[PDB]
Amino acid sequence: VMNRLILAMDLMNRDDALRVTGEVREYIDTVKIGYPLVLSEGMDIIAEFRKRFGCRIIADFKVADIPETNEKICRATFKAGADAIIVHGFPGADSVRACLNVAEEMGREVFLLTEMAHPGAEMFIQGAADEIARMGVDLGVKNYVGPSTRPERLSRLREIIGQDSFLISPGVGAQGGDPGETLRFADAIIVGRSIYLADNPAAAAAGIIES
Amino acid sequence: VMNRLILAMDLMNRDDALRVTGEVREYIDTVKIGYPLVLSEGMDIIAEFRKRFGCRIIADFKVADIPETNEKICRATFKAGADAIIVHGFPGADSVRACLNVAEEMGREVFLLTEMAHPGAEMFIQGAADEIARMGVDLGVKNYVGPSTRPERLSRLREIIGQDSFLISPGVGAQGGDPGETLRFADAIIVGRSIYLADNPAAAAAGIIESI
Numbered sequence: 508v509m510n511r512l513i514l515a516m517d518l519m520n521r522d523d524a525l526r527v528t529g530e531v532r533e534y535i536d537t538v539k540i541g542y543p544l545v546l547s548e549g550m551d552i553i554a555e556f557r558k559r560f561g562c563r564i565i566a567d568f569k570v571a572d573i574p575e576t577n578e579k580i581c582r583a584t585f586k587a588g589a590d591a592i593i594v595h596g597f598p599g600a601d602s603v604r605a606c607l608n609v610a611e612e613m614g615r616e617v618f619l620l621t622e623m624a625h626p627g628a629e630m631f632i633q634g635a636a637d638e639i640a641r642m643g644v645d646l647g648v649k650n651y652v653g654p655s656t657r658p659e660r661l662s663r664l665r666e667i668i669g670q671d672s673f674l675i676s677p678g679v680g681a682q683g684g685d686p687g688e689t690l691r692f693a694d695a696i697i698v699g700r701s702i703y704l705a706d707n708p709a710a711a712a713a714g715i716i717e718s
Numbered sequence: 719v720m721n722r723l724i725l726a727m728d729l730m731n732r733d734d735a736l737r738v739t740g741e742v743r744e745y746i747d748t749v750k751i752g753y754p755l756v757l758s759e760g761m762d763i764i765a766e767f768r769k770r771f772g773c774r775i776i777a778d779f780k781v782a783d784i785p786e787t788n789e790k791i792c793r794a795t796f797k798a799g800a801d802a803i804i805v806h807g808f809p810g811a812d813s814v815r816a817c818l819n820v821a822e823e824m825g826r827e828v829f830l831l832t833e834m835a836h837p838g839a840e841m842f843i844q845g846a847a848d849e850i851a852r853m854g855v856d857l858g859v860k861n862y863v864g865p866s867t868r869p870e871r872l873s874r875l876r877e878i879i880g881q882d883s884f885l886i887s888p889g890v891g892a893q894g895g896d897p898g899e900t901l902r903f904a905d906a907i908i909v910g911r912s913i914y915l916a917d918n919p920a921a922a923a924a925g926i927i928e929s930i
């Protein structure tokens with residue numbers, strides 16, 4: 508990923524989202540689009556971004572349903588042009604396999620979310636995280652998401668998945684995570700608010716890269 | 719809910735979804751719309767269904783993000799006209815609280831998903847389910863979702879949330895759950911494929927209602 512930095516574009520109106528993404532395009536070539544923007548502006552926004560900025564798009568949909576529904580969600584998402592989709596591992600192996608099957612059929616990728624970065628993640632997710640990561644390895648998952656806010660957990664996750672797996676990590680900046688420390692374990696960092704709420708998003712992105 | 723039956727409308731094209739929903743409207747007045755339909759036809763489909771069929775709409779979005787993002791998802795969903803939203807409890811109390819705060823601000827409801835009905839739910843969700851339900855009670859959640867496929871777990875869930883809470887349950891029909899047994903514990907059952915993939919959805923819905 509360009510500069511090992513992925514922009515989390517969670518603004519909810521198309522004009523602001525287009526403005527910020529265009530301003531930071533010289534620093535990042537991969538954008539993570541989630542439900543805040545998609546449910547506000549429509550799925551067509553994925554193809555619009557891919558074309559206008561020539562960036563890879565990761566759909567952060569935290570897929571977390573039964574197998575049959577997960578398949579439908581993944582198919583609609585890849586039809587919309589997403590290059591990859593983020594899926595929760597807490598619902599179990601069959602739910603993750605359903606996403607992997609659709610990605611295989613459509614020539615796309617699945618990122619498995621193992622542990623989340625917010626405080627509430629300590630209640631139930633953290634205790635299941637190592638097992639969720641091992642499940643991913645057993646299913647053949649090669650792309651993972653882990654927390655910038657807990658580098659000791661990111662280290663443990665990297666250990667389970669190996670150095671060959673691709674690991675991206677949110678929670679940098681606004682949630683307290685540090686870019687440099689996170690990149691000791693993750694291949695790329697995800698940054699949203701620290702860039703998109705900045706008075707000068709380009710300067711904020713440039714600063715992160717400088718750091 | 720009318721006849722204690724909620725239709726899970728997971729068809730992915732507007733014309734088919736409109737046809738089936740209209741055919742079974744005399745049997746059910748509450749429709750659950752999820753991402754399969756919304757990501758295929760747009761969020762405007764929620765208001766269209768609400769108006770066209772005069773039914774309550776539950777947005778089954780299995781919200782499962784950090785607090786800040788959950789707030790945005792809930793706000794966009796209620797702006798689109800949904801009467802309620804289904805949220806996962808596994809990400810923790812702060813994430814659930816964020817959804818409850820937006821529902822309070824907008825005069826809407828949050829349904830907390832405690833245990834899922836599919837086989838994979840046994841891996842991680844089941845072992846956390848009782849605690850997730852208790853967390854819901856502690857947060858003031860009054861609406862819950864539990865599995866038709868495991869009535870013993872549904873009974874345990876009803877036990878934690880009390881008789882005053884509203885409990886709806888998917889997994890009836892296609893996934894193996896039984897309407898009658900599920901209604902021993904849930905206030906309403908959710909049915910998707912058994913109705914929408916039937917050669918005659920109205921007859922399928924009518925049969926379910928007669929079996930209970």
Ligand SMILES: O=c1cnn([C@@H]2O[C@H](COP(=O)(O)O)[C@@H](O)[C@H]2O)c(=O)[nH]1
Nearest residue numbers: 515623624677678681682698699700787
């Ligand atoms: O454990 C996780 C998984 N995903 N995200 C997501 O990554 C982005 C982080 O944004 P932020 O830089 O503004 O905090 C948001 O889209 C958020 O939903 C997290 O924050 N934590």
Ligand SMILES: O=c1cnn([C@@H]2O[C@H](COP(=O)(O)O)[C@@H](O)[C@H]2O)c(=O)[nH]1
Nearest residue numbers: 576726834835888889892893909910911
């Ligand atoms: O634990 C859960 C939670 N939600 N659903 C959802 O309820 C519906 C059940 O549909 P079905 O009757 O066709 O199996 C689908 O929309 C599905 O995503 C389940 O099946 N199980």
